[model samples]
Target: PVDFTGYWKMLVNENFEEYLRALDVNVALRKIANLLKPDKEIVQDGDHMIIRTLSTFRNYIMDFQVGKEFEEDLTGIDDRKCMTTVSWDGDKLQCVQKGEKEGRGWTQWIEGDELHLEMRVEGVVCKQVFKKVQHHHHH
Candidate 1:
């Protein structure tokens, strides 16, 4: 299994506003979200993982075990609750979020120095590419 435990800063965000539009996100909120660049902090241990998407406007924190189903609060993003699950599909981490909207979730995988995320809701898909940052090993 690929270890995806690192600090990732987003480099490219594509079709994000379209993805938000599919969820019926408010135009005003979408405007702010579109302009913000976020960082993803991932902590993984075996099947358990904590994923945090941090930005100046808000932060989304989610912790779950692979193959386990859990209720996720979406107050920061959409103000709705969802039953979310994360599973390993090959080297990619695939998520299924069942809620008020259908076909909502994202897939994440790492390649070289980049972490790739494909966020989808309904038919619109948003792709975000992030570069991993290195921390000094000796202190």
Candidate 2:
């Protein structure tokens, strides 16, 4: 089984700045994000996972316990804000971000040797796919 229960790194972005710019991430933030390598950790138990993205600027953490509902502040991604909740749609993890910004959020999953991540904000939807690299074990 190609379980996504491990640490990962940013391989590359399909549409990097385009997605950031759509979220009003600004030139400075986008510049930093574009050039820097962020570390990601995903701890999965059954269908649930705790996803965390670490960087020098800031770190993003999400506790998604499968079918459960909770709110998420996308303060780092988009300053627009939202009451976000994630749920599994088949093998793909789906997210719905409800807020003043109309339709938003994304769906994420793994395919073969790669992980697929999608982000939707302010009506603009972009897909980011990352190839799986060897996990660097840490204690």
Candidate 3:
């Protein structure tokens, strides 16, 4: 398993609003979401993993066990119940969300010092790239 435990700052977000639209998020929320940059922190400990999407306007946290199917309720993004399972495809972490929506899921991978995330909903795909923040040591 890849050690993906670090805070990543968003550098670029492509078609993020369109992806939110596919999820049926409110237009007002999308407007605000479009303007704000978000950060993601991933913590993987053994089979347990927690991913947090942080923003000033809104935040989303998901905790689940790898390779275990569990019911997930997406609250901040979209209020929906789905059976979610995460697995590894080579070096990329892949997730499948099974619910009323068709073809909704996401995949994340680390490329050098950058973190790449692809979110999919319906036919829309949003690509987000983040750079790892450097930790400063001050004496």
Candidate 4:
């Protein structure tokens, strides 16, 4: 199993505005979101995981268990409710979000020292690449 426990900062973000538009976000929020680059912190323990995407504009956090489907209320980003399930597909982590919108979900995978994430909403697909940050270990 892939152990994603680190601080990753976004290096590339593509088509994110279209994604926010698909989620029916306002023009002001979308503009603000476009100018901001976020950082992601992931803590994984066994089948349980906590993922947090933090930014200057807003922050999003999700706590979920692998293979277990649960209701997710996206409070910060989009603010939508969906039934979400996350599972491992080979070496990649895949998530399926069943909601009112079409093509709504995301997938994450690790590539060497980088973390790749693909977010889909309606007809828009946003791709974000994050590089893992090195941390100082306390003795």
Candidate 5:
């Protein structure tokens, strides 16, 4: 695994409106959602993992195992259902989500101090980047 465990703050969000559109989110919702920056928390212990996507306004948590296929519901977000699995492609953490939506998933990896995330839905790709927080450890 990439060991993405850390307290990370969102630095950038790109093409978020387009991604929301691909998922059939409402125009009013997409407008605000595009503006909200999301914080990321990743915890990994062997095959066990917890990934939390916290916005400046919301919190969504995903708990699963590496390479394990499980039902994932975007109930609060897009109201979609999918079978999701997370696996490592080299040092990058890759997710595969199978559902009515085509080519939906994300690729996450660290580039030095920066965490890069690419979210895909249909043909649209949303880019997100985060920076590791320094005050998270060793008090």
Candidate 6:
């Protein structure tokens, strides 16, 4: 899991809006996400990280350490409030989003050079696969 921490660029936009809308993301936000390329910054520390989903229109950030609970405001997006927690299931990271909707949450794992993500809300599961890009490191 050492190399798993870093920035990931979203390469595919397949069914992107459908996934967002399934989470009850409104028309305006969905439209913005479709046009703008979203970049995710994943910083891992011990069993936790602060993940930020960044785009020109909006940014959603979450900090979760395994077995610890934190407040997650799905602000400007889902418009829902929730308590988010994360834990490791084998090498895969599982996120539990306890909120207004049942079975609402997501999971992320790595396969080869790709990152696999599955987000669900109200029994609707949206799957997303992102390929890792070689980013030039300057430090």
* Best prediction by lDDT: 1
Candidate 1 vs candidate 2, lDDT winner: 1
Question: Candidate 2 residues 1-139, lDDT tens each?
Answer: 4367766667766666777787677788888877766666788888677888777777888876777766676545555556777777778888887776656778888987777888876767666666666757553
Deviation in Å, model 5, residue 13 alpha carbon: 0.7
TM-score of 3: 0.90
Deviation in angstroms for 67 in model 1? 0.5
Give candidate 2's TM-score.
Answer: 0.80
What's the TM-score of every candidate structure? 0.93, 0.80, 0.90, 0.91, 0.91, 0.83
- Model 5, residue 96: distance off in Å is 0.9
Regions of model 2 farther than 4 Å from truth? 135-139
lDDT of each: 0.88, 0.72, 0.85, 0.86, 0.85, 0.74
Off by over 4 Å in 6: 1-3, 136-139
lDDT of 4 by residue, 40-134 (tens): 88999888999988877777888999899989987346788999999999878898899888878889999998999999878789999999997
lDDT, candidate 6, 1-139, per-residue tens: 5346767777665566776777777788788667876677777878768878777777788877788988877633666788888888888888888877788788889888777788877767667676776673432
TM-score computed on alpha carbons, candidate 5: 0.91
Q: Compare candidates 1 and 4 on TM-score and give the better one.
A: 1
Superposed by TM-score, candidate 1 places the C-alpha of residue 76 at a distance from the truth, in angstroms, of: 5.6
Candidate 6, residue 135: how far the Cα is off, in Å: 3.4
Give the CA lDDT, 0 to 100, for residue 111 in model 4.
Answer: 92
RMSD of each: 2.8, 2.5, 3.1, 2.8, 2.6, 2.8
Q: Give the range where candidate 2 is weakest over 10 consecutive residues by summed lDDT.
A: 73-82
Q: Model 1: how far is 37 from its true place, Å?
A: 0.5
Deviating ranges (above 4 Å) for candidate 1:
135-139
